[PDB]
DNA sequence: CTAGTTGATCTCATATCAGGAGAAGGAGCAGAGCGAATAC
């Protein structure tokens, strides 16, 4: 499972970094290029793929 | 100021004096707008703004969510408080919406019936403003960081595009020829800007810490390479003659086009003689920027002294171009400011930032 | 004497000798010289393209336009079989050009490097063969040539040949090609010629192929789907107007 | 679309430039005077001036200089227009016929560029190798003359110094050498360059930059025997030649800055220098055997406030003035027993800056009469104008008038005036405010170098003597004045809007509206009202007082208690500078939003923004022509007529008429100077022109338009300037052709052509019909 | 000297799971130790 992801907003490969703040149960995914940021709740079973998942889902939901 | 009015009435001073002095005074009194608001439609940060060059009424805004919003800035209501309503919108439901962030949007000069928008989806789309449909699309092999149409060209209608490729593309809007490229950079071309003075002069700033001026008619590469030291540290041109000690992510010709303001990721802005690229050694102090993409900043027009409005963190730093003296910080944004566009008719400013807000700064009183 | 817009005094006693298309070609060449770009005199054989070149260079020398007080050192790369013809043409149109041939036959009777140095030192008119460009490609390109004229420039039709690389190692903005046909087999040759005259105008050859050559040939077949032929027509139009101001073909 | 007819009732009278030389003939000593659009050529006789020609340029003459190229029998005249039409003209007299042939012409407007602060500068190399223009910051345009052009092809040389104060060509230099004073953050410095036409670029000057006085504002190129230059500043006069550095600081020039100069002798042994206060000094260069020994300045005397001056001969000096009457003065060898060597020989009338003017039917005739606040500080006056030619009286006030209004019931004019006191305070001269029959000072309970003292002068409208002079509070500027009766009481009042002016602020925060009544030869303060800003403009609006405090247009009612009570306000203005009225409608001229058609809805009791123009025109004056036509004057010397169109788009005023007047209109007023056209709006300008706007009918306007095009095809302009270009609406960020306006001067020129040219005009009715039409058009003024 | 013939050589162009063991790097934690920094 890759940790760096293509940004849904600027389509820059591996430009998204994921930070797991487990102490606060929050994952923050940020694109280095276009500076888009997204915050989602996470669990101890969560992974950066799950945070990027929640980001893609939030984008598609907001774009309806 | 009653002295100014009296001098204008009595012919002591040219009306030019009152006009430019009052423009400068208005710019100095720039403050968060007391009675004005801008409609919020972008779901993501606004990366770019552009007020149309003719009549200065309509404003384009490209968001990080790929939508393009067209606002009317005129207060068509009778109240002193109004919101800049959104006339049109390339929203998520438009068949031609950009799939990724719109990074530059520009009105067609000489006419408001067309505009252009480049995105990180590797497309420069040319839109008919009336039908709001894509009149043309130019696809690129690599993401677009910036683009610019000449604000002066009555003859050519080239769009200079800077992508992550090391080549500056020149897309002819006259019969579509995107094959023309300029060689000489080595990394992503983060900013491009046509000279407002000279028709065929284009300045390009790239991540290789170099700024090059090209005569696009010419067959022999760039005209000038900007050098910080002008020759104090002189070396055979392979890696020397850098404009900055980092990525040069913003360009802006001054109003007359005789100087060039370059902002780079070394936390420095520099002013260059646009005719021979000599550094004028204007200080400006430290200009905080760490943007990994192009940084959009503008200069004032029609004032006694020229000003430059640079995004500075979550603020707008206003500097005097030719002295470097720091005027002020416009402080009303909650995240880093991506773009600021200057309305020259009324000395107004519109700033878009990552907080999904377009804030209007108006002169006080 | 005929005078152009910015001032390019082509002499009357030469300009009167040209034909209407020849004078148009001189006008076009000098427009290129003002834009500091190169071109292709793609006029087919028999019209007379050397006469246009000598007339234009003679006007550029007498007009004393300036870098260089008038015309500087120019190199003409032509097949051997016409080299002597070229010098005679100069000597009958514009005598005061110190024209010199670089060849084993030649007239220098000394070291050829000394000939290059001496001719450049006098801003002369130096004629070579393509082979000498290839062999002395490092030596001949050190003396700040002001013009490069590849007569029968279809020798550059291959973007791989060592002659193409040696000819593209020149530095001047001024690159003129005298070829009866810019392309002979396919668009590789058009791209190579345009990479010579104007390094940046047409894109890198991969880009050029993928945009122009494949769609055009795919639309050159009668079993092509209608979309294919329409795209081929559009791309041909784009290539045509892109090359319009730099290929003068009659 | 609107239909308007503009005609010049009185040609411009303010002189903005005067040059002497041999223009008409090799032996004649010509005086060329540039009034704004008019070039007047006189021949300097032994006595006075003999007018030989008067041509009307299609342009505001910003530069006017005479130069004699090698081989030319007589001087050629270089004229640059404010819209940057350059022309080289020659005088060709063929017997009775006089022609100003355009030897060369062109347009030198750069498409983009910051116009320089100190204004357009035009200089000519003393050997006439080139013309150097400073039009924009950072650039120096050069028009070579050795290359004989008929199109005046020019090239810009980039000038590293961006704030150039003044520039001249030095004398006795092998190469064209410019010496100029420029301002950088380190101070003001005088630098030199040697222009190269072959390389088209500057080269290192004969002598390096030298740091000059902070207010060093003038450069004077001394002729060959001395060479170098003289820099005049506010406090000192210095002379540089590269190693000679002479300097003086005469205390007598400290009081006022020197604004003009002229060279008396061909060798520059003497110069004239005029200051803004009118003082004329002689700067003498003492030579030593040649180099320069020492500089002296001696006060010759006092003249009108000189924009320019020119020594003709025999001690005669033409003092050309913009703020007062131009003068022809004599420099006596010996003093006049008052310390002054200057004696006025002749005075040429100048309607100075016409800041305000009122049309009055004085003498109870059917004829109008313009009473204009003309002139400035020392040259301020009232001018009374009638049709008799135009007869112009003059009532010298010796202080600047600002506003004027006529009170028919009281048989007097209320005139706002302003004088300068130096120190508590002392008047520099006995002014009309101080020479009133009776006087008073405001004692207001509301509020508790050189300064301006403002007064309300009650002036008898028979003898034009100052019946009264009421001085205002300390540091109070009176801005507006209106004579009207408010509410329902019968008394007629002088209502004065004021502002409290202190140096610590940029916009007045305090002011008051004072209601005076003039009765029994006394000016009693009937009422006061402290307001929170400068009352820029006031007007009577249906018996109420419509005032404009800094950004708020508000309405006051006159109560039974004889006090002003606010009724309604409108705040959607930057600064409402100009107010006009017709019925329930108000026209608010804004500083930079340019118009606002407001309506007072009486059934409710507030204002309603009926419409607005969203174009950013900076206003100088505004007027209401018809129920739906609104005339306005922009500070860029343009007239524009807005029209209420026919949704929210109904709130957009449409600019249905555009025109470039070439004059800074200060005031409009309904009225006519005479006993086919609808309406009559006179206007007064800064350069002294009085013009007249009338509305035309559609078919007639179309026919006139056709005549204008025909005349443009026939009549040849002096500088080969196209009339459409000259009248094209022009602003630094906009340029449009003229629409909805007929140039009355061009139409009236239809009389001054011969019959074959008329037939050329009227190729496609007969010529006599159009002669009748233009005669009827001339009747209105 | 001096041109014409003879071979070699190069370029260019013609299409279509039931390993294991050890050594080197990097990671995260743990503490020790010393500079500054409040503060009694
Ligand atoms: Zn991104």
Curated annotation (Swiss-Prot), chain B:
Instruction: State the Gene3D superfamilies in the record.
Output: YVTN repeat-like/Quinoprotein amine dehydrogenase (2.130.10.10)
**Which SUPFAM superfamilies does this entry report, sorted A to Z?**
WD40 repeat-like (SSF50978)
**One cellular component (GO) term of this entry:** nucleotide-excision repair complex
| Pathway membership | Protein modification; protein ubiquitination
- Compartmental location: Nucleus; Chromosome; Nucleus matrix
One Gene Ontology term of the biological-process aspect is:
response to UV
Q: What does this protein do?
A: Substrate-recognition component of the CSA complex, a DCX (DDB1-CUL4-X-box) E3 ubiquitin-protein ligase complex, involved in transcription-coupled nucleotide excision repair (TC-NER), a process during which RNA polymerase II-blocking lesions are rapidly removed from the transcribed strand of active genes. Following recruitment to lesion-stalled RNA polymerase II (Pol II), the CSA complex mediates ubiquitination of Pol II subunit POLR2A/RPB1 at 'Lys-1268', a critical TC-NER checkpoint, governing RNA Pol II stability and initiating DNA damage excision by TFIIH recruitment.
**Stated name of the protein:** DNA excision repair protein ERCC-8
Q: Which organism is it from?
A: Homo sapiens
Provide the organism lineage as a comma list. Eukaryota, Metazoa, Chordata, Craniata, Vertebrata
Q: Which gene encodes it?
A: ERCC8
From Swiss-Prot, chain C:
Quick one: effect of changing residue 157 to L? In a colorectal cancer sample; somatic mutation
Family (UniProt) = Belongs to the SNF2/RAD54 helicase family.
Q: What protein is this chain from?
A: DNA excision repair protein ERCC-6
Pathological association: Cockayne syndrome B: A rare disorder characterized by cutaneous sensitivity to sunlight, abnormal and slow growth, cachectic dwarfism, progeroid appearance, progressive pigmentary retinopathy and sensorineural deafness. There is delayed neural development and severe progressive neurologic degeneration resulting in intellectual disability. Cerebro-oculo-facio-skeletal syndrome 1: A disorder of prenatal onset characterized by microcephaly, congenital cataracts, facial dysmorphism, neurogenic arthrogryposis, growth failure and severe psychomotor retardation. COFS is considered to be part of the nucleotide-excision repair disorders spectrum that include also xeroderma pigmentosum, trichothiodystrophy and Cockayne syndrome.
**Quaternary data:** Homodimer. Binds DNA. Interacts with ERCC8. Interacts with RNA polymerase II; interaction is enhanced by UV irradiation. Component of the B-WICH complex, at least composed of SMARCA5/SNF2H, BAZ1B/WSTF, SF3B1, DEK, MYO1C, ERCC6, MYBBP1A and DDX21. Interacts with KIAA1530/UVSSA. Interacts with ELOA and CUL5; the interaction is induced by DNA damaging agents or by inhibitors of RNA polymerase II elongation. Interacts (via WHD region) with RIF1. Interacts with SMARCC2/BAF170, SMARCB1/BAF47 and the neuron-specific chromatin remodeling complex (nBAF complex).
Can you tell which superkingdom this protein's organism belongs to?
Eukaryota
Q: Where is this motif: DEAH box?
A: 151-154
Name the reported effect of residue 96 to A.
In a colorectal cancer sample; somatic mutation
Indicate which residues the UniProt annotation says bind ATP.
43-50
Describe the location of the Helicase ATP-binding domain by residue ranges: 30-200
Where is this protein localized, as stated in its record?
A: Nucleus; Chromosome
Curated annotation (Swiss-Prot), chain D:
Q: What is the effect of changing residue 618 to A?
A: Impairs interaction with AMBRA1, ERCC8, DCAF5 and DCAF11
For region WD repeat beta-propeller C, the annotated ranges are: 389-696
Q: Which Gene3D superfamilies match?
A: 1.10.150.910, YVTN repeat-like/Quinoprotein amine dehydrogenase (2.130.10.10)
Q: Which residues carry this modification: N6-acetyllysine?
A: 720
- GO BP term, pick one: epigenetic programming in the zygotic pronuclei
Source superkingdom: Eukaryota
According to the record, the residues making up region (Interaction with CDT1 and CUL4A) are 447-781
Q: Does the keyword Phosphoprotein apply?
A: yes
Could you tell me which pathway this protein works in?
Protein modification; protein ubiquitination
Q: Which UniProt keywords apply?
A: Acetylation, Biological rhythms, Cytoplasm, Disease variant, DNA damage, DNA repair, DNA-binding, Host-virus interaction, Intellectual disability, Isopeptide bond, Nucleus, Phosphoprotein, Repeat, Ubl conjugation, Ubl conjugation pathway
Say yes or no: keyword Metal-binding present: no
Q: How is it modified after translation?
A: Phosphorylated by ABL1. Ubiquitinated by CUL4A. Subsequently degraded by ubiquitin-dependent proteolysis.
Task: Report one GO cellular component.
Answer: cytoplasm
Record-level Gene Ontology MF annotations: cullin family protein binding; damaged DNA binding; DNA binding; protein-containing complex binding; protein-macromolecule adaptor activity; ubiquitin ligase complex scaffold activity; WD40-repeat domain binding
Which InterPro entries does the entry mention?
Beta-prop_RSE1/DDB1/CPSF1_1st (IPR018846), Cleavage/polyA-sp_fac_asu_C (IPR004871), RSE1/DDB1/CFT1/CPSF1 (IPR050358), WD40/YVTN_repeat-like_dom_sf (IPR015943), WD40_repeat_dom_sf (IPR036322)
Q: Which residues carry this modification: N-acetylserine?
A: 2
| Assigned protein family | Belongs to the DDB1 family.
What disease is linked with this protein in Swiss-Prot or TrEMBL?
White-Kernohan syndrome: An autosomal dominant disorder characterized by global developmental delay, variably impaired intellectual development, hypotonia, and characteristic facial features. Some patients may have genitourinary and skeletal abnormalities.
Query: What's written under domain?
Result: The core of the protein consists of three WD40 beta-propeller domains.
What name goes with this protein? Answer: DNA damage-binding protein 1
Q: Which species is the source of this protein? A: Homo sapiens
């Amino acid at each position: 499972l890759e940790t760096q992801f293509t940004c849904p907003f600027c389509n820059h490969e591996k430009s998204c970094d994921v930070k797991m703040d487990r102490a606060r149960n929050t994952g923050v995914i940020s694109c280095t290029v276009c500076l888009e940021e997204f915050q989602t709740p996470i669990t101890y079973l969560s992974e950066p793929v799950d945070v990027y998942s929640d980001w893609i889902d939030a984008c598609e939901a907001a774009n309806q | 100021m009653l002295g100014f009015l009296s001098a204008r009435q009595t012919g002591l001073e040219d009306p030019l004096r009152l006009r430019r002095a009052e423009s400068t005074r208005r710019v100095l009194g720039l403050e968060l707008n007391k009675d004005r608001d801008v409609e919020r439609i972008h779901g993501g940060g606004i990366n770019t703004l552009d007020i149309e060059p003719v009549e200065g009424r309509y404003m384009l805004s490209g968001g990080s969510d790929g939508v393009i919003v067209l606002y009317d800035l005129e207060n068509s209501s009778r109240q002193s408080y109004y919101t800049c309503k959104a006339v049109c919108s390339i929203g998520r439901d438009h068949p031609d919406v950009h799939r990724y962030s719109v990074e530059t949007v520009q009105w067609y000069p000489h006419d408001t019936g067309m505009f252009t928008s480049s995105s990180f989806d590797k497309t420069l789309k040319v839109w008919d403003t009336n039908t709001l449909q894509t009149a043309d699309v130019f696809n690129f092999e690599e993401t677009v960081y910036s683009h610019h149409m000449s604000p002066v060209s009555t003859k050519h209608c080239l769009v200079a595009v800077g992508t992550r490729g090391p080549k500056v593309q020149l897309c002819d809007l006259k019969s579509g020829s995107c094959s023309h490229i300029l060689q000489g950079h080595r990394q992503e071309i983060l900013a491009v800007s046509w000279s407002p003075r000279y028709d065929y002069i284009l300045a390009t700033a790239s991540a290789d810490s170099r700024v090059k001026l090209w005569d696009v008619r010419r067959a022999s590469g760039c005209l000038i390479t900007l050098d910080q030291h002008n020759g104090k540290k002189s070396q055979a041109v392979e890696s020397a003659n850098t404009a900055h000690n980092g990525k040069v992510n913003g360009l802006c010709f001054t109003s007359d086009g005789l100087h060039l303001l370059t902002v780079g990721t070394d936390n420095r802005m520099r002013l260059w003689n646009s005719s021979n690229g000599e550094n004028t050694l204007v200080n400006y102090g430290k200009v905080c920027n760490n943007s990994k993409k192009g940084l959009k900043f503008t200069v004032s027009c029609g004032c006694s002294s020229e000003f430059v409005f640079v995004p500075y963190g979550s603020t707008i730093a206003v500097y005097t171009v030719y002295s470097g003296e720091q005027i002020t910080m416009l402080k009303g944004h909650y995240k880093t400011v991506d773009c600021c566009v200057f309305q020259s008719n009324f000395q107004e400013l519109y700033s878009g930032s990552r907080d999904c807000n377009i804030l209007a700064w108006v002169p006080s009183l | 004497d005929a005078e152009f817009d910015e001032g390019f005094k082509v002499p009357g006693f030469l300009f009167k000798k040209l034909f209407k298309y020849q004078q148009t070609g001189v006008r076009w060449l000098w427009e290129l010289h003002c834009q500091q770009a190169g071109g292709i005199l793609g006029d087919e054989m028999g019209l007379g393209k050397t006469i246009q070149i000598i007339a234009f260079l003679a006007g550029l020398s007498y007009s004393k336009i300036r870098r260089f007080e008038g015309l500087g050192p120019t190199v003409i790369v032509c097949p051997t079989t016409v080299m002597h013809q070229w010098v005679k043409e100069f000597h009958t149109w514009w005598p005061p050009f110190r024209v010199a041939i670089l060849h084993e036959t030649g007239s220098y009777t000394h070291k050829k490097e000394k000939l290059i140095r001496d001719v450049a030192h006098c801003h002369g008119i130096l004629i070579t063969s393509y082979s000498y460009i290839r062999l002395m490609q490092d030596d001949i390109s050190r003396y700040d040539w002001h013009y490069v004229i590849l007569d029968e420039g279809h020798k550059i039709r291959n973007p791989n040949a060592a002659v193409t690389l040696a000819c593209k190692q020149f530095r001047t903005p001024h690159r003129i090609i005298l070829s009866g046909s810019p392309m002979q087999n396919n668009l590789r040759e058009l791209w190579s010629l345009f990479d010579f005259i104007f390094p940046g105008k047409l894109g890198t050859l991969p880009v050029f192929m993928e945009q122009f050559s494949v769609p055009i040939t795919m639309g050159g077949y009668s079993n092509a789907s209608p979309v294919q032929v329409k795209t081929a027509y559009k791309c041909a139009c784009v290539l045509r107007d892109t090359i319009n101001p730099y290929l003068l073909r009659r | 679309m609107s239909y308007n007819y503009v005609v010049t009732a009185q040609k411009p009278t303010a002189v903005n430039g005067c040059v002497t030389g041999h223009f008409t003939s090799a032996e004649d000593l010509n005086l060329l005077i540039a009034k704004n659009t008019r070039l007047e050529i006189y021949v300097v006789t032994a006595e006075g001036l003999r007018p030989v020609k008067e041509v009307g340029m299609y342009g505001k003459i910003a530069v006017m200089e005479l130069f004699r190229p090698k081989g030319e029998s007589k001087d050629l005249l270089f004229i640059l227009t404010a819209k940057y039409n350059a022309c080289i003209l020659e005088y060709k007299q063929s017997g009775e016929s006089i022609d100003i042939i355009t030897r060369a012409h062109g347009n030198v407007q750069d498409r983009i560029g910051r116009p320089s602060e100190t204004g357009i500068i035009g200089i000519i190399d003393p050997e006439c190798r080139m013309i150097g223009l400073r039009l924009y910051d950072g650039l120096f345009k050069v028009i070579p003359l050795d290359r004989d052009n008929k199109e005046l092809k020019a090239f810009n040389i980039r000038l590293e110094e961006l704030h150039v104060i003044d520039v001249k060509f030095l004398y006795g230099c092998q190469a064209p050498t410019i010496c100029f004073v420029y301002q950088d953050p380190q101070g003001r410095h005088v630098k030199t360059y040697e222009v190269s036409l072959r390389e088209k670029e500057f080269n290192k000057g004969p002598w390096k930059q030298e740091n000059v006085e902070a207010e060093a504002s003038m450069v004077i190129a001394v002729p060959e025997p001395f060479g170098g230059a003289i820099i005049i500043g506010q406090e000192s006069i210095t002379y540089h030649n590269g190693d000679k550095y002479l300097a003086i600081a005469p205390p007598i020039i400290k009081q006022s800055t020197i604004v003009c100069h002229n060279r008396v002798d061909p060798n520059g042994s003497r110069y004239l220098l005029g200051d803004m206060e009118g003082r004329l000094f002689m700067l003498l260069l003492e030579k030593e055997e040649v180099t320069l020994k020492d500089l002296r300045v001696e006060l010759l005397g006092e003249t009108s406030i000189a924009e320019c001056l020119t020594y003709l001969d025999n001690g005669v000096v033409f003092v050309g003035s913009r703020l007062g009457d131009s003068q022809l003065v004599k420099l006596n060898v010996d003093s006049n027993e008052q310390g002054s060597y200057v004696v006025a020989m002749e005075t040429f009338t100048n309607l100075g800056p016409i800041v305000d003017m009122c049309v009055v039917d004085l003498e109870r005739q059917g004829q109008g009469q313009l009473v204009t606040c003309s002139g400035a500080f020392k040259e301020g006056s009232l001018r009374i104008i009638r049709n008799g030619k135009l007869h112009i009286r003059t009532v010298p006030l010796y202080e600047s008038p600002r506003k004027i209004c006529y009170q028919e019931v009281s048989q007097c004019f209320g005139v706002l005036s302003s004088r300068i006191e130096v120190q508590g305070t002392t008047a520099l001269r006995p002014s009309a405010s101080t020479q009133a029959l009776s006087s008073s000072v405001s004692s207001s309970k509301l509020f508790s170098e050189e300064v301006e003292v403002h007064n309300l002068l009650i002036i008898d409208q028979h003898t034009f003597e100052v019946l009264h002079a009421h001085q205002f509070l300390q540091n109070e500027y009176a801005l507006s004045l209106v004579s009207c009766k408010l509410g329902k009481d019968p008394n007629t009042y002088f209502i004065v809007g004021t502002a409290m002016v202190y140096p610590e602020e940029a916009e007045p925060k305090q002011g008051r509206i004072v209601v005076f009544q003039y009765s029994d030869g006394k000016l009693q303060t009937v009422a006061e009202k402290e307001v929170k800003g400068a009352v820029y403009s006031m007007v009577e609006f249906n018996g109420k007082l419509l005032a404009s405090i800094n950004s708020t247009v508000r309405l006051y009612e006159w109560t039974t208690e004889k006090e002003l009570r606010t009724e309604c306000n409108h705040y959607n203005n930057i600064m409402a500078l100009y107010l006009k009225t017709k019925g329930d409608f108000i026209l608010v001229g804004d500083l930079m939003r340019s118009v606002l058609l407001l309506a007072y809805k009486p059934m409710e009791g507030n204002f309603e923004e009926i419409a607005r123009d969203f174009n950013p025109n900076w206003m100088s004056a505004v007027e209401i022509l018809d129920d739906d036509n609104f005339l306005g004057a922009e500070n860029a010397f343009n007239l524009f007529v807005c029209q209420k169109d026919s949704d929210e788009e109904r709130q957009h005023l449409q600019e249905v008429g555009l025109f470039h007047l070439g004059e800074f209109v200060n005031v409009f007023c309904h009225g006519s100077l005479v006993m086919p056209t609808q309406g009559s709006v006179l206007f007064g300008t800064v350069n002294g022109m009085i013009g007249l706007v009338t509305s035309l009918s559609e078919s007639w306007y179309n026919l006139l338009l056709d005549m204008q095009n025909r005349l443009n095809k026939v009549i040849k302009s002096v500088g080969k300037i196209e009339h459409s270009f000259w009248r094209s609406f022009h602003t630094e960020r906009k340029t449009e052709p003229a629409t909805g306006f007929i140039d009355g001067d061009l139409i009236e020129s239809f009389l001054d052509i011969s019959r074959p040219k008329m037939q050329e005009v009227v190729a496609n009715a007969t010529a006599d019909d159009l002669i009748k039409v233009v005669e009827e058009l001339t009747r209105i003024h």
